[PDB]
Amino acid sequence: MRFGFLLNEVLTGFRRNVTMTIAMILTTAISVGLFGGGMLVVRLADSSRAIYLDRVESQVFLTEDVSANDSSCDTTACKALREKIETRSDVKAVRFLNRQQAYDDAIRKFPQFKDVAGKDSFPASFIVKLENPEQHKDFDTAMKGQPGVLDVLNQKELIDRLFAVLDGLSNAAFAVALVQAIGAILLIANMVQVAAYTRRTEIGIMRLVGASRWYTQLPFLVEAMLAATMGVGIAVAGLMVVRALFLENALNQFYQANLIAKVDYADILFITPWLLLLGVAMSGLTAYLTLRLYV
Amino acid sequence: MRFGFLLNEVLTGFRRNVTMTIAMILTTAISVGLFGGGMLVVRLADSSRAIYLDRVESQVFLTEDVSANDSSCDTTACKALREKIETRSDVKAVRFLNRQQAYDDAIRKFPQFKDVAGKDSFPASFIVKLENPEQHKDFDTAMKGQPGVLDVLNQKELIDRLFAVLDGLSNAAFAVALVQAIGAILLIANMVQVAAYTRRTEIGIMRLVGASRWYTQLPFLVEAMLAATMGVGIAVAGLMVVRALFLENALNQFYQANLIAKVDYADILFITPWLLLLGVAMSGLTAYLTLRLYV
Amino acid sequence: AKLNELSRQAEQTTEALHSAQLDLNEKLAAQRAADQKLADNRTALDAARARLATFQTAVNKVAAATYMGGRTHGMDAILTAESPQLLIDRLSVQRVMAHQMSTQMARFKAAGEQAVKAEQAAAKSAADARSAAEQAAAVRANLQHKQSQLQVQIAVVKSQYVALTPEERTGDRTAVVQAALTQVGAPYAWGGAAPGGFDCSGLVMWAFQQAGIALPHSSQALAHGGQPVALSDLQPGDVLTFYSDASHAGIYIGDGLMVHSSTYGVPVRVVPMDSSGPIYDARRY
Amino acid sequence: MMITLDHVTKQYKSSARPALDDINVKIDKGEFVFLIGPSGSGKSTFMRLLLAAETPTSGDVRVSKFHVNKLRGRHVPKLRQVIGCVFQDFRLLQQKTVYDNVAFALEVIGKRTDAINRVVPEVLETVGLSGKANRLPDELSGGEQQRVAIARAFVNRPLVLLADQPTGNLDPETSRDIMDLLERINRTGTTVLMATHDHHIVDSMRQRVVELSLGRLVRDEQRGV
Amino acid sequence: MMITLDHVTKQYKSSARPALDDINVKIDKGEFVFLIGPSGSGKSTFMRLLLAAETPTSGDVRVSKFHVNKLRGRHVPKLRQVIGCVFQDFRLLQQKTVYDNVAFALEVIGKRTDAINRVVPEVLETVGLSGKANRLPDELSGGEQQRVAIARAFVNRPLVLLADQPTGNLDPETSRDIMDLLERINRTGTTVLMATHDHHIVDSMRQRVVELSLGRLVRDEQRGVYG
Ligand SMILES: Nc1ncnc2c1ncn2[C@@H]1O[C@H](COP(=O)(O)OP(=O)(O)OP(=O)(O)O)[C@@H](O)[C@H]1O
Ligand SMILES: Nc1ncnc2c1ncn2[C@@H]1O[C@H](COP(=O)(O)OP(=O)(O)OP(=O)(O)O)[C@@H](O)[C@H]1O
């Protein structure tokens, strides 16, 4: 029947145990906020993975006269450099990359040259991949000063420290969010017990006069619904202020360092429905069987 | 002193509600240990800044026309400044930097910008070392626009700007610690309104028997103190396993670079008494005045 | 009674060339100045394109230079350095290198703004020069039409009036006193600006041209845009331009020197200065 | 058409006296049934047996509609609208009003809106407190707070209205008001099952008195004082 | 002076009829008084007024030992050692035996364990909990669960044992012996004060029965009966 009676009875619980309800909001905000912060840095690392080079990669470049011509591997100068790096079994493959593919990704490698920086500027690459990325300093020195190669670039041997601290921070946030969620599960069971103990005087009335079983759990479950939605809302609103107060001076210059991409007030909106369908279901699965096994 | 009466009731009190008890254990461990982790990164920040004071180098640049026409300091314009700086109370030694080597020392340090970096873009400079490089306000009010200098770099805030993202992480941890600490205080506050309710049948009689007013809330306090101290005890144990499992590879990867102070188990155990007293105070001051308004 | 009106209409046809000549002169000076200013703006645009090209080559070299791993910020130096000794050197080099980057970006942006402003100025100058050439063509178009119309009155004055009228039906600013010695006996030449053709207002060189002057010979520009003169103030500056808008302004050589031809050849008689009628007829210079 | 229980049993931790043993008493629709007995009789368990809130270990329970010995949890609240109970502690909500306490079984069922207020003054006219139905029950004296507890269980018509200690704390002067109210309730056609715990009223009614002593049935003749 | 209180009143909020007038009551030491008052009006506020659970709005409640209407920060239990208080409900402890419920009210006032075994097992055999006294009160019948609440009150030998509805909900067959137990504390010199609503039990011994109507005392009979 009509929901006009459920709306003006939850205000009694909103005034009866005020010191218990807002503690639930504060701990559920910390739980799903730490979970959201853990998911945001995983999204951050996955968005920032495309800037650098992967596990099996070693960037190399070409001299100006070779890269000015040879738009495809058709001149003998291309095979002359390819064959000498197929002489050694340290590498496995060389990807075909040339001048034309070096500017359609110029937005991707550096989102700062979004203007017309200029064609015929970025050197051709012919980059290599090797299965043993520790003993390649000798390879880089063999590519140092050789007549036909400009220079090399490496993202391993103590350059890929960025992802190792991002993964550690993500797992730390996930662990603290997980144990906070375990504490939240126990507080689910306590608030329904508090609402049962303080407001038992009509539970017996509804048990005697012939209330249906499902309608008895409805006022306690809608309390858990409003508590979970209020907690997730305060957590999302807290993510904005923890970014805006003292992370708009320390995180933003990584983009000017060209290390990580945009995280803004938009990609949190792509995870906020997942925060809702996590937090509200997390409250409501665990606020049901407590009333079944005790009420 | 009647301690054996208090020793056996606390187990029955824990069996009266172990659910709320372990909820308070979890939220106490998280709120206290997260503040402890916020203190540890403050310790790491200035302890890893302190391993740079013996090697940080203050630098002052020179104007162009005393360096554009001569390589070494041979003109009489720089002969005043060449030994004006040794006439100082806080300088070890002064080494002049030729402009020719100060161009290609960057190229030797990293073979990059070998064509675009300007030849007349690196001014000549000197060397100054201070007993107080952090307190470099002596040169801020002395190195004015003298005839022979261009600008004052004012030692460097580069290391100070560099070690600021973890300061942002520290006060993020402090903000989350206070936010969850409010919920911890509130969960202490409603600990006793269900701890007295679950065993009314004897706290409702020693009011009307003649027990002292201090001895009423004493067993409702001692169990909260034991809960707080085992929560702090597992807080440091959980911080051990988030340091040694998730941040561990991140710190051992900075081990070989020797850039971080490398906080060890002795360093987290150094802050254990202050953390424990904070937990005992936060669960003793707020588990006492909530009984003055209840019993 | 027909002996006067045939030259009366021809007088405007004679002075039309002199009236249009000054317009033509100011139009050609205007289009020459516009062409010179447009050429200067084209040179400025070429210089702006040259500085844009060299700063473009600089910005492509620095855009390439960061693609080989050139990092100039400072935050990723602790992601790159392996010892605190050279980390300080990396920060010190990148602190001035990022200053070089910022100066190059500011210089490129200023060069782009200056090139855009120079292109807009060159476009406006080219539009102004094209407009000036348009008025030059417009004031040529009526000029070649009325120059052909100038030859119409020759057949009715120098060809039709010469059959009849035989021997029976026919101070110091001048310094010439009697401008009738080589001046009479010349019944016009072509009604134009011939140096010696003696066409109505074509006698200004023998009297007024004595200390330079170089007046434009219009009898309309100085009739309106000139300093006024009073004949009653003993200043001989009044002429016979009264009751005839844009007409001849011949200065009398003394008092009563009407040296001209009525239709084709006339003598000079001492008649009073009766041509001065309405106001705003003629001025001094 | 019989509404009783027989050969029931109930043990929670120890057997000792396992609630009741076997019950053969004839109760009819419109009978004053008393339940005198000592405090060890387990008369509240006998209340819960007809309430289907305590599951019997043996026997069967059937109050005039169906056997509730093995009734599922889906249909157990359906056999609760015809059941009425009054207790010692009056079961009153403090924050609500005197009208709101008796108008509480209306909205929990979900009947027609016009039939909500069409019966509340109709049942306040047969209880005694016809008037002063707007004051707070906290400010009301305890004599009429019991009549609120009877008048609350009149929204649906109860076939049996079983009492569980409705006096004993009340004054004998105001016990007359409570006792004669149930007489007019029984004139509607319903039965009541009294469970008083004293001697003065049970030697005043000469009605069907059923005694029970730890499962054993002490004195049963269904008449007399 | 002896135990005498007068002019006591406590006007609660939102109550135009607080049912506490300024009545000058007077009792006798060693004498039993029965306060069979009305229902729900004032039968408990006066009953807790001797224990000073509610602070009176006016008057000076007094006992034979010290002043009761004014306290300090350390004198509130000093009133309540000598109070033996019994309610309607049994309120035993469900985690300990009948031999431990009586002794539970002894270490809360600071009594050594050597004096427990010489005093506490010298009490509950007088009330009727004899023989073994090891049965758990969760399984005992309510006839014997009330007398242990009586014996819990008589531990430090109080001079007053005030009781609110002692029979409460019991048959007269198991309430007639309650009079025979309570007279054994009554003849020891204890001013036992019983608030009851059961007639024809206090009409037998004909002791001092008082009654308020709606907030004022109307019956003061030293040997009266209930009407
Ligand atoms: N839920 C229960 N759990 C355990 N034992 C119970 C329960 N209900 C009843 N008993 C047992 O039955 C005995 C009497 O039951 P019950 O509570 O119904 O008695 P009663 O006659 O209504 O009297 P009173 O309310 O005065 O105790 C109890 O003393 C206890 O031994
Ligand atoms: N804690 C309280 N706060 C405010 N008013 C109270 C409180 N307790 C009782 N009252 C008021 O006191 C009156 C009830 O009567 P009183 O407290 O004197 O006891 P009683 O009802 O006669 O006794 P018993 O509690 O044994 O039934 C009502 O007016 C009620 O509002």
Author numbering:
A (entry chain C), B (entry chain D): 1 to 295
C (entry chain E): 45 to 214, 271 to 385
D (entry chain B): 1 to 225
E (entry chain A): 1 to 227
According to the publication:
The FtsEX complex is a widely conserved regulator of peptidoglycan (PG) hydrolases. Instead, it functions as a transmembrane signal transduction system for activating PG hydrolases. Briefly, the ATPase activity by the cytoplasmic FtsE powers the system through its ATP cycle, interacting with the transmembrane FtsX. The signal is then transmitted from the cytosolic FtsE to the two extracellular loops of FtsX via conformational changes, and finally to the coiled-coil (CC) domain proteins.
To further investigate this hypothesis, we conducted a cryo-EM study on a MtbFtsEX E165Q mutant, complexed with RipC, and in the presence of ATP. In this mutant, ATP can bind but not be hydrolyzed, thereby serving as a competent mimic of the ATP-bound state preceding ATP hydrolysis. Our cryo-EM analysis yielded a 3.9 Å map of the complex, wherein the EM density for both the bound ATP and the catalytic domain of RipC was well defined. Detailed comparison of this structure with the ATP-free complex structure demonstrated that ATP binding brings the two FtsE subunits closer by about 3 Å, leading to a 2.7 Å restriction at the extracellular ECD domain. Regardless of these conformational differences, the tilting angle of RipC relative to the FtsEX central axis remained consistent, and no conformational changes were detected in RipC with the NlpC/P60 domain remain attached to the coiled-coil domain. This integrative functional and structural analysis suggests that in contrast to P. aeruginosa, ATP binding alone in Mtb is insufficient to trigger the activation of the hydrolase, indicating that further ATP hydrolysis may be required.
